[PDB]
Structure formats: structure tokens, C-alpha cells
């Protein structure tokens, strides 16, 4: 049972609790920071968001979250084989055949709505999709020009280790030094608007040079498809994308500003039963990045 | 430019409507924030309260239940009606333009910033005293001199603070003394001021100190010759 | 309450902040001389108005952490008074009250002797039946003064009143002192003095009924 | 911290109790090379 007050909008927390120290029989009232979106309700009682699904596990304050080009290799007696097509759509017979015995250098990068870090495209702009006629098919538009995105909890947050056993200690948010601000994205409006056209140009190839393209965000579902979810420097982002798929186009310095949230109890994939609290990150993270693809879903003017 | 000159009772009785003015000088009265501060004698500057250009009402927590600052754009005129009085009301009551600042430290989109409000030019002062003691005018006795001599006037029992004094009413300024009340246990503050004069003119110039004291609406006059 | 602060003359002041920030902050210095206006020094943490003197500066807060201080270099005896430190920033909310007032005193001024003037009770007042004596002090620093009345050669100490040392234009004390007397205990004695010991001297002024 | 103690490894590590069946007697071992080597 944790004791939380607002932290002097009403987002991030300050919570108290008893802690077990490393006696078996002394307890210890510490206190730490909590995000909203780690703390439920019954000073105010409230309780971290897990403990009536899942147990928790913190991760090792060592690893890192770097996504490191990764090459996939075929074992002796097998081959890869690439496609040298520079307009080369999902599936087809691909004219320009080389073969490899390793992938590429390929980057785990686990995000949303928004291919962070990715390949481009050469020539121009692909789009794919198993049936394109199949709304229930997630397109996966890739661009030939990055999209720069810039990203930043600007936060000065401090860690405060918490012995709570013998070799065991929680990393807890110990305070803000300094301002209190919002985590937020940006985008160049004008390098986002022509990467919009691109987009919007293949889009006709297939429904029409006449028909009007329509962007809206996300109708529903989780935080963590409604929103462009990603990591940065450590912390899980959770990003409105309302300021970036609101355009309706017809048959014929700038910056946006993308207000994200932050969360430290993640369930990583649909994992039911486990749950991870990241641990805080010292400083003002910032992180540099290329917006390379997308996921659009059409609706089905 | 802009100046302020307050003005009031000077003397309250306790459990009462503390009754007060400000009249500006120089500037509208419609768009500048005014503020009202307060000093006791060894307590600090407290903040009264404060209105707007847009003639809002905000006052400080400690009092508030008991403050309602008014406004009249009729004329460069401001009040203050501090009610309830109690014997710890007694202060300087001060009549300040207070300017906004707004500090950005973020973006100003999200709200990341606060207003901060600066008082850059002060009315000069207007004392107030809560005691259920009457009023009582002073009475003028004078001091008669005796290279250089000095002579001065005797301002003795009047209640209360304060009581001005000017000489051959405004001529005579240059060596001017006016010293500092005394308050004698009877409950009456006894001023005296002197003025340090040239011999050879002490049987010539006339010399006449001009007491004021405004609680008591007296104006008196007295002449010093040896 | 009030925070002792002693510099020299003509030396740099540094008036630390009584709060210190949480966040970013927009801190408003004030100077104020008792029974007088408040003056402003410095309202945004840097700016001053118009009317300061440079060797007023405060700390602007480019960098977090600094700490917000009045600096007063070439200090002179006019720049005793008490100073304020209206601090807001964006983790407090609406700072009402002002600073804690650091009464800085400034050290090394030139010590100056009073200057003693004893008036009769005047023939008004005599007529009146009630005296008065009026002992005036001025221009003497450091100020604070001890003053002693007597009757002929006798100690008096019934019924005197005295102001104690306010402060004059010029940077020096002042203080009255009041004997009430009866109109015949004014009269059946040969004179009267008023002893004024400042520092360590004193100086006399006697006055007899003639 | 009668007088008050504790184990000297509670403020900075956990502590396992080597299970008592196994002998901390120095056997001869042999370090062999793979075929090839
Ligand atoms: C992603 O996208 C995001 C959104 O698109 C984007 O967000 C942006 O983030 C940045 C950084 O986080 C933000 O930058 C901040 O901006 C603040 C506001 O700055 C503006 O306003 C001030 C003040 O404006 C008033 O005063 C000027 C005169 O000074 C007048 O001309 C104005 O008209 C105005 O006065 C009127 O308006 C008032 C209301 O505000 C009324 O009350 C008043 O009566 C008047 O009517 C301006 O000075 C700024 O001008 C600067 O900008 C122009 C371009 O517009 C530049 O060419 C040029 O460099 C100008 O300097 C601007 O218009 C800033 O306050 C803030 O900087 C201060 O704060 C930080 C942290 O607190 C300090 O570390 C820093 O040092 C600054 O402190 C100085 O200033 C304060 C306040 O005055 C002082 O108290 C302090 O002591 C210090 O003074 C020192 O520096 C002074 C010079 O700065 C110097 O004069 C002093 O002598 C002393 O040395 C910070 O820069 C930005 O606002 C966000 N964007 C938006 C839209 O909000 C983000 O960056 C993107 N990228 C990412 C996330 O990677
Ligand atoms: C999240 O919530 C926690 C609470 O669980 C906050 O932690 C507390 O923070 C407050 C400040 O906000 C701390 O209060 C401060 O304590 C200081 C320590 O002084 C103590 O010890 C001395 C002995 O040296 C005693 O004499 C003294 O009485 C105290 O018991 C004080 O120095 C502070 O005093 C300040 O305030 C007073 C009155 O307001 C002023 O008069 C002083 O001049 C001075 O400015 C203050 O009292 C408290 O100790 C913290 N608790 C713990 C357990 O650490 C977190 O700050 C909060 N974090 C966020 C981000 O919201
Ligand atoms: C997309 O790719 C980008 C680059 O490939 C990613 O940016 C990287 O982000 C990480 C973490 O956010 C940064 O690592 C941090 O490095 C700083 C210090 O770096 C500085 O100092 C070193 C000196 O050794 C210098 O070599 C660097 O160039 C910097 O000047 C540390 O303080 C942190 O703890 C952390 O280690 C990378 O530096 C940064 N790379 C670049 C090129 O900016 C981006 O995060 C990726 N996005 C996603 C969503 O994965
Ligand atoms: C933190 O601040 C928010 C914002 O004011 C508080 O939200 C209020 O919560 C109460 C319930 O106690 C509601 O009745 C109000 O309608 C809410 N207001 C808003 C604007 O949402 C919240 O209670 C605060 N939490 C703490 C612990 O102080
Ligand atoms: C664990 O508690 C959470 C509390 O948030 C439950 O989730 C909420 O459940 C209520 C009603 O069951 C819904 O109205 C909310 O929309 C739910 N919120 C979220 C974020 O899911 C959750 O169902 C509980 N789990 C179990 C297994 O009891
Ligand atoms: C984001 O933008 C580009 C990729 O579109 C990268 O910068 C270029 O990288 C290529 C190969 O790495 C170089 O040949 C170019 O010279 C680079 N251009 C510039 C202007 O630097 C950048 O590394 C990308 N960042 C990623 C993928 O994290
Ligand atoms: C974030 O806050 C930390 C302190 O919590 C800052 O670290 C300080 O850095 C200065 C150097 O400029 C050192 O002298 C201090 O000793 C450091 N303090 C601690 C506690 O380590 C850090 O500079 C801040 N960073 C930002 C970007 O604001
Ligand atoms: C994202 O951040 C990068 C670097 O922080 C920005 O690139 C800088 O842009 C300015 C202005 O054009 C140049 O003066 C710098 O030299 C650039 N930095 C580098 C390392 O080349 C970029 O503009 C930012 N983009 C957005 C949308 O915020
Ligand atoms: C993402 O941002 C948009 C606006 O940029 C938010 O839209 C708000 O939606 C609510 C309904 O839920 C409306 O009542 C508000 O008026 C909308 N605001 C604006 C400015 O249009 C949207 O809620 C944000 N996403 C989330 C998940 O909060
Ligand atoms: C755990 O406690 C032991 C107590 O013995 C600490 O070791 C002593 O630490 C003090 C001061 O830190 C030194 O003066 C002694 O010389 C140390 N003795 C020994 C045997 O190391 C130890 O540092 C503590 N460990 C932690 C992580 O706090
Ligand atoms: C810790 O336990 C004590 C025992 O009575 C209780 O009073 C206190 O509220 C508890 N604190 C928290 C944060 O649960
Ligand atoms: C890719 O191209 C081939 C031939 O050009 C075509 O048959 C196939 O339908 C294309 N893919 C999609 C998803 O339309
Ligand atoms: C999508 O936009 C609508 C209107 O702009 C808004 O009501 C809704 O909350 C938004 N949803 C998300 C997930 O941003």
C-alpha cells in the first residue's frame, strides 16, 4: 500500500510505503516517484498497476536498450537470397537475384506506428500489403527520405537505490532536480509534409487518382498501439500522434509537437502474467532519430 | 511619469472598517496592476493584495477574509477596505504599481511557465493606528534662541502619529531639524523640531514653524524672538 | 525575522537568498530603509530598473543550480538598510510573502560626535503650568547615545523620556530627550544640565532659569 | 549495530549455505584435448 501525493498536470507522483530493509525484521519508510500510468487507487492510498495481474521484475540496471545491428546467417548448406529490385514490391518474382549468407546489419527496434531507425527505400517510395483491398491488413509504407524526429523527456531525474534485501536493491526515482516539463517529440512540418505527399501519391496508384486521402490517429485499442511507442535513452515513450495524421488531400522554421507520456511497468510483447519495471534514468534524456516507415490501417473517400 | 500620494483616518478604532485611498499621478489607473503592502513596526513587508488592468481580485490568504481592494476609473483613485481591525493592523500602509512578468522556462504551448509580479514605483507612506483612545490636537510652545544660533518649536501631547512641520510655510528649509516623536507614558508622542539660523539675523526674519496634525483637522502657527 | 549581515565601506556585498529555487526562478530584490518606501533593485534576476546604480547585480539563473544573490560592490553607508528576496519559481506556486530581510550594516563609517542643544521651558507653557526641558542630539555615529539630566549637581532620572537613535539624512543619529518638570521645581533650582555620553565621552549643556 | 550483531554479509550480499553432501576435497583432475588437438 503506497502513499501518494501530487508532486507540487497531477501527472508523476510522490509515493510513500513501509520497506523491508536488510533485516528480516526491521521495515523502513522510504519514498519514490511514480508515473500515473504505474499507480492505481483503492494522502491517498494507491498501489503499483501489476501487482493484481503479475509479479514484477526490475531490469538489470546494465543492460542496455541500444538496438544493436543484428546479421542473421543461414547455417553450412543453406543460402539467403536478396533482391536487388529497387521497386520491389512485397511478393512477385524478384528479376535481380543475389544471394548472402548473413542479413544485413538489422536493428531490433521495437516501435509503433512510426519505423524508427530503419531502412530506407531507393527510387521512390514503396508501399506493401499482403491484399491492399484487405482493410484488416496493416500497410507498411516505406520512405526513400528520412523523416527527422527529435525526442525528449527534459526531466532532470535523479536514481535512489533502495535496499530492500540482502543483495537485492530497487531503483527507485529519488526527485526532479530542477523543472518540471513535458516529454514531447518533434518533427519538421515541412519535411513531414512532403513526406505526406510522397506517401499520398503511391496511395492512388491502387484507389484512384481521384479519390480523396484521409489522415486521423488511432480509433481505439492500448497505450501502446494507440500512441507511437517507442525507447529513448532508456525510458518507454508513449507519443500522441494526432498532430502528425490529420490531412485530407484532394485529387489535385516549422515543427510539430507530439505530447508523450512515460511508463515504467511495461509488459514488453502481449506477455500475460510477467512485467518489467524499468529503471529511472539519471539526467535529461534525449534522443535523435530517423522515422523511416509506418503502419497505416485503412478504414473502408 | 507615474507617482502615488495615499491618504486616510491615520487612526482606527479596533473592530472597524480600515478605510483607504491612493490617487496616481501621471498614468491610467486601467492598465497597470497596483498592489497594497503593508510594514509593521519589527514584523516585514507583507502583501496586502492586488488588482489588474482588468480590475481582478486576488488577495493574500493571511488576510483576505477580511480585504476587498476597489477601484474607481472615475479618477487615478484606488481603495482598500481592510475591516475587523486589531491592535496588530498598526503598520505603513504603501501604494505600489506592480508589473507583470511572465517566465517562460519550457514551452509556452504545453503551460510551462508562471507569472511573477514586480512593484517598481511606491506611494510614499501613509501611517495607520488601531487604539480605542480619542484623537487629541497637539498644542505649539516655542523655543526662543539665545555666529550661529538655533531655535526651534515644541510640539507636545497629541495622539497619533503623525505631525508635520514646515517653517515660514515652506520658505525656510535650508538647516531644517525635525527630530523623531517620543511617546511619553501618558499614551502621547511629543515632537520638536529646530532650525539652525544665522545670528545676525535673528532680530530681523520673521520666523514661523507651521504644525500640522491630521487626525485632529488642527492647523497652529507660533513665532520665536528672543 | 532578520538576518545579520556585516561589510566594510566601499567593499562587494553578497546578500545570499533566504529561499533557494526549486526550479527555474524569477527572483525580485528590494531594499528597504525603515519608515520609508521600498525601492526596487533588481525585478527579472538580472534586470534592474531604471535609477540603480551598476554596483547593484544579481545572479541570473543561466545554468540550474546557481543560487540567486544580491551583489552590492563599493558599498556605501547610504546602503544600509533591510534587503529582500522575492523568489518565485515554477515548483512553488504563488510566493505572497517577501524574503527574509538581511539588515546589512556597513562597517568602518567615520564616528562622528553629537551635537547637544538644551532649550528652556518655554514662557507659554510656563504659563501653562507645565516645563520642559528638550535636550536635541544629532549627527553623532554610531548611534547610540546615553544621556544623563541634572538638577543643580543631582541625578534626576524621574520623569525623562528618550528617543532612541534614528537615523538622519546624512548617514548619522539622532535623538531627542524630553524632562518634564513643574512649573516650580524649574524654579527653585539653579540650573540644570544634560549629560550626553556617546562612545565613550561625554558632553555637556547646561540651562538655568533667567 | 546482550549486545546487538548481524551476519557480516546482510548489508551487501545474499548468502547460500553450501549444500552438505558435497566434499570440498581436491580430487585429481584430468584436462584432456578434443580429437584433433
Ligand atoms: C521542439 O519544439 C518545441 C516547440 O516547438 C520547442 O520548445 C521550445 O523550447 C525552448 C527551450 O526549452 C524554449 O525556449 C525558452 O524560451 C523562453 C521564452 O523565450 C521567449 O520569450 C522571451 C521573453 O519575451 C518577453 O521579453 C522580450 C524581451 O526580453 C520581449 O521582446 C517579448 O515580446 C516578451 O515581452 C512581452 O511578452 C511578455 C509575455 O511573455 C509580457 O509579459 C511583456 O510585458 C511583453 O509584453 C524572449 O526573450 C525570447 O526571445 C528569444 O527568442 C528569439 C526568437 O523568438 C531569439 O532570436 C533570441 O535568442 C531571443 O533571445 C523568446 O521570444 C525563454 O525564457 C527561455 O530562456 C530562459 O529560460 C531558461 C530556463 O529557464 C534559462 O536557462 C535561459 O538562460 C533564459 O533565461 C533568461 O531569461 C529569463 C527571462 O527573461 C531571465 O530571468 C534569466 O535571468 C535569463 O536572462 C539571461 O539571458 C537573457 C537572454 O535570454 C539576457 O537578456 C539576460 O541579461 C540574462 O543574461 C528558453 O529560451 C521555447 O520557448 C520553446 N518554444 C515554445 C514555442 O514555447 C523545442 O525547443 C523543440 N526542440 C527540442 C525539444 O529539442
Ligand atoms: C516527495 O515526498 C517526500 C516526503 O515523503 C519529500 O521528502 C521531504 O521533503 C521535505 C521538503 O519538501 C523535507 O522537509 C525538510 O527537511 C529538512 C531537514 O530538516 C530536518 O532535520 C533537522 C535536523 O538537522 C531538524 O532540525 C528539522 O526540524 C527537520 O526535521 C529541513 O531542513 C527543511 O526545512 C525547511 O523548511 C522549513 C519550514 O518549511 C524552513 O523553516 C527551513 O528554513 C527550511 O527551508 C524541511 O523541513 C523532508 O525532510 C523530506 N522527507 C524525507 C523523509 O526526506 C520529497 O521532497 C518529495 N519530493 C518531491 C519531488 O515532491
Ligand atoms: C536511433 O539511432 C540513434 C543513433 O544511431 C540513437 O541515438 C543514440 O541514443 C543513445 C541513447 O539515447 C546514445 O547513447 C548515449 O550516449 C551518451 C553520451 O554520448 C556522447 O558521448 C560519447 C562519448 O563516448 C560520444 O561518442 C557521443 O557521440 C555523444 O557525444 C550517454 O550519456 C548515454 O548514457 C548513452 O550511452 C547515443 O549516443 C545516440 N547516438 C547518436 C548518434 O546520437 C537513437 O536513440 C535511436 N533511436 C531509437 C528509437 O532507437
Ligand atoms: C492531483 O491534482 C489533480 C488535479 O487537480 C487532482 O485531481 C482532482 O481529484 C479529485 C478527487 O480527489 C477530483 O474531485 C477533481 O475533480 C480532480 N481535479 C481535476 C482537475 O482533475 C488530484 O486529486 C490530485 N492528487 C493528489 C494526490 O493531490
Ligand atoms: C487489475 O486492476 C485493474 C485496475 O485498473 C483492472 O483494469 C480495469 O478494470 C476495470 C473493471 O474490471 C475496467 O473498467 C478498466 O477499464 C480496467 N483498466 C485497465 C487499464 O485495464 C484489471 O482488470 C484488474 N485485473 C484483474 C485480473 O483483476
Ligand atoms: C538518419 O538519416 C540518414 C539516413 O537517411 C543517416 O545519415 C546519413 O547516413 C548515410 C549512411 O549511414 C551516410 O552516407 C550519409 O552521409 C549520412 N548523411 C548525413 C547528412 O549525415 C543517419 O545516420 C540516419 N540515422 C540513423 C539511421 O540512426
Ligand atoms: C542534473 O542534475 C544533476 C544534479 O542532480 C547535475 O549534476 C551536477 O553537475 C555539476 C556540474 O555542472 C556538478 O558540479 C554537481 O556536483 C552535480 N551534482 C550531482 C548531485 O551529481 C547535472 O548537471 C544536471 N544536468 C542537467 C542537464 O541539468
Ligand atoms: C533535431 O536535432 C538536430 C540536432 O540536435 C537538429 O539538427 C541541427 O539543426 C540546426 C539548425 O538547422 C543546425 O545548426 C545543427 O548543426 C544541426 N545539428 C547537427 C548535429 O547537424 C535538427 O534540426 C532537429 N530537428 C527537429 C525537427 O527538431
Ligand atoms: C491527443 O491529442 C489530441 C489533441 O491534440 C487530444 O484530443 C482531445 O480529445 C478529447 C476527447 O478525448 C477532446 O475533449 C479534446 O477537446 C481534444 N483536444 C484537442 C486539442 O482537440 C487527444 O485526447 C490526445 N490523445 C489522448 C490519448 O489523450
Ligand atoms: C557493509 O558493512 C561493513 C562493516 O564492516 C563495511 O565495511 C567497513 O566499512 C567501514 C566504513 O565504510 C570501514 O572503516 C571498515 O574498514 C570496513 N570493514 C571491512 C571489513 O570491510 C562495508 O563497507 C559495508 N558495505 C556496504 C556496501 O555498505
Ligand atoms: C507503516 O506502518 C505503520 C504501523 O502502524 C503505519 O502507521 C504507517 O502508516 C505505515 N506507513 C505506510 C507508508 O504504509
Ligand atoms: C507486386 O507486383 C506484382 C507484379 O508487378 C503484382 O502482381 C503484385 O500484386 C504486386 N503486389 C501488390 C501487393 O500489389
Ligand atoms: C483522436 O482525435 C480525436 C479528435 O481529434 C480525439 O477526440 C481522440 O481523443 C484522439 N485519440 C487519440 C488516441 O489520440
Known amino acids: 500500500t503506497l502513499q501518494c501525493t501530487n508532486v507540487t498536470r497531477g501527472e508523476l507522483k510522490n509515493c510513500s510505503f513501509n520497506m523491508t530493509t536488510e533485516l528480516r525484521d526491521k521495515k523502513q519508510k522510504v519514498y519514490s516517484l511514480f508515473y500515473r500510468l504505474d499507480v492505481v487507487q483503492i494522502n491517498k492510498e494507491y498501489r503499483l498497476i501489476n501487482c493484481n495481474t503479475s509479479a514484477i521484475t526490475q531490469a538489470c540496471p546494465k543492460v542496455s536498450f541500444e538496438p544493436i545491428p543484428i546479421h542473421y546467417c543461414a547455417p553450412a548448406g543453406f543460402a539467403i537470397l536478396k533482391c536487388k529490385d529497387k521497386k520491389f514490391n512485397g511478393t512477385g518474382p524478384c528479376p535481380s537475384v543475389s544471394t548472402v549468407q548473413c542479413t544485413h546489419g538489422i536493428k531490433p527496434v521495437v516501435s509503433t506506428q512510426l519505423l524508427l531507425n530503419g531502412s530506407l527505400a531507393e527510387e521512390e517510395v514503396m508501399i506493401r500489403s499482403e491484399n491492399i483491398t484487405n482493410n484488416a491488413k496493416n500497410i507498411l509504407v516505406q520512405f526513400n527520405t528520412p523523416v527527422q524526429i527529435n525526442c525528449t523527456r527534459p526531466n532532470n531525474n535523479t536514481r535512489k537505490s533502495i535496499r530492500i534485501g540482502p543483495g537485492q536493491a530497487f531503483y527507485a526515482t529519488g526527485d526532479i532536480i530542477g523543472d518540471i516539463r513535458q516529454a514531447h517529440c518533434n518533427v519538421s512540418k515541412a519535411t513531414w509534409n512532403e513526406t505526406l505527399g510522397k506517401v499520398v501519391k503511391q496511395l492512388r496508384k491502387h484507389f484512384g487518382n481521384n479519390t480523396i486521402i484521409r489522415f486521423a490517429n488511432s480509433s481505439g485499442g492500448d497505450l501502446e498501439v494507440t500512441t507511437h511507442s517507442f525507447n529513448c535513452g532508456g525510458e518507454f515513450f508513449y507519443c500522441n500522434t494526432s498532430g502528425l495524421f490529420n490531412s485530407t488531400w484532394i485529387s489535385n522554421n516549422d515543427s510539430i509537437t507530439l505530447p508523450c507520456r512515460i511508463k515504467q511497468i511495461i509488459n514488453m510483447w502481449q506477455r500475460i502474467g510477467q512485467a518489467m519495471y524499468a529503471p529511472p534514468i539519471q539526467g535529461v534524456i534525449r534522443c535523435v532519430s530517423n522515422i523511416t516507415g509506418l503502419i497505416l490501417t485503412r478504414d473502408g473517400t | 511619469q507615474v507617482q502615488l500620494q495615499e491618504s486616510g483616518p491615520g487612526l482606527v478604532k479596533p473592530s472597524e472598517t480600515l478605510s483607504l485611498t491612493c490617487t496616481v499621478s501621471?498614468?491610467?489607473?486601467?492598465?497597470?496592476?497596483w498592489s497594497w503592502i503593508r510594514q509593521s513596526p519589527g514584523k516585514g513587508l507583507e502583501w496586502i493584495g492586488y488588482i489588474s488592468d482588468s480590475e481582478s481580485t486576488n488577495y493574500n490568504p493571511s488576510l483576505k477574509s477580511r480585504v476587498i481592494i476597489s477601484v474607481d476609473t472615475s479618477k487615478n483613485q484606488l481603495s482598500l477596505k481592510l475591516n475587523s481591525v486589531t491592535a496588530a493592523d498598526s503598520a505603513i500602509y504603501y501604494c505600489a504599481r506592480a508589473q507583470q512578468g511572465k517566465r517562460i522556462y519550457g514551452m509556452v504551448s504545453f503551460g510551462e511557465f508562471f507569472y511573477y509580479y514586480y512593484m517598481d514605483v511606491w506611494g510614499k507612506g501613509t501611517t495607520v493606528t488601531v487604539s480605542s483612545a480619542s484623537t487629541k490636537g497637539p498644542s505649539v510652545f516655542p523655543l526662543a534662541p539665545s555666529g550661529t544660533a538655533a531655535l526651534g518649536c515644541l510640539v507636545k501631547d497629541y495622539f497619533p502619529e503623525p505631525v508635520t512641520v514646515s517653517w515660514n510655510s515652506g520658505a525656510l528649509t535650508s538647516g531644517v531639524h525635525t527630530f523623531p516623536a517620543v511617546l511619553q507614558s501618558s499614551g502621547l508622542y511629543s515632537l520638536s523640531s529646530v532650525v539652525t539660523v544665522p545670528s545676525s539675523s535673528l532680530g530681523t526674519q520673521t520666523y514661523i514653524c507651521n504644525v500640522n496634525h491630521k487626525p485632529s483637522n488642527t492647523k497652529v502657527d507660533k513665532k520665536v524672538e528672543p | 525575522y532578520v538576518r545579520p549581515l556585516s561589510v566594510a565601506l566601499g567593499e562587494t556585498a553578497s546578500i545570499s537568498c533566504g529561499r533557494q529555487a526549486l526550479g527555474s526562478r524569477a527572483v525580485q530584490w528590494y531594499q528597504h530603509r525603515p519608515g520609508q518606501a521600498p525601492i526596487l533593485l533588481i525585478y527579472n534576476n538580472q534586470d534592474r530598473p531604471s535609477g540603480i546604480p551598476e554596483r547593484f547585480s544579481g545572479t541570473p539563473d543561466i545554468n540550474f543550480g546557481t543560487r540567486a544573490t544580491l551583489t552590492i560592490s563599493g558599498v556605501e553607508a547610504g546602503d544600509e538598510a533591510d534587503y529582500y528576496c522575492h523568489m518565485w519559481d515554477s515548483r512553488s506556486g504563488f510566493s505572497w510573502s517577501f524574503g527574509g530581510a538581511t539588515r546589512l550594516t556597513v562597517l568602518g563609517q567615520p564616528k562622528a560626535a553629537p551635537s547637544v542643544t538644551l532649550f528652556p521651558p518655554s514662557s507659554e507653557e510656563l504659563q501653562a503650568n507645565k516645563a520642559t526641558l528638550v535636550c536635541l542630539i544629532s549627527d553623532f555615529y554610531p548611534g547610540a547615545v546615553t544621556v544623563a539630566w541634572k538638577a543643580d549637581s543631582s541625578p534626576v532620572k524621574a520623569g525623562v523620556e528618550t528617543t532612541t537613535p534614528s537615523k538622519q539624512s546624512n548617514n548619522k543619529y539622532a535623538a531627542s530627550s524630553y524632562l518634564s518638570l513643574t512649573p516650580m521645581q524649574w524654579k527653585m533650582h539653579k540650573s540644570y544640565s544634560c549629560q550626553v555620553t556617546h562612545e565613550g565621552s561625554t558632553v555637556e549643556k547646561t540651562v538655568a532659569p533667567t | 549495530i546482550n549486545k546487538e550483531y548481524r551476519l557480516i554479509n546482510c548489508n551487501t550480499s545474499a548468502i547460500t549455505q553450501a549444500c552438505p553432501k558435497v566434499s570440498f576435497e581436491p580430487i585429481p583432475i584430468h584436462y584432456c584435448a578434443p580429437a584433433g588437438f
Open positions: 501621471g498614468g491610467s489607473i486601467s492598465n497597470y496592476y
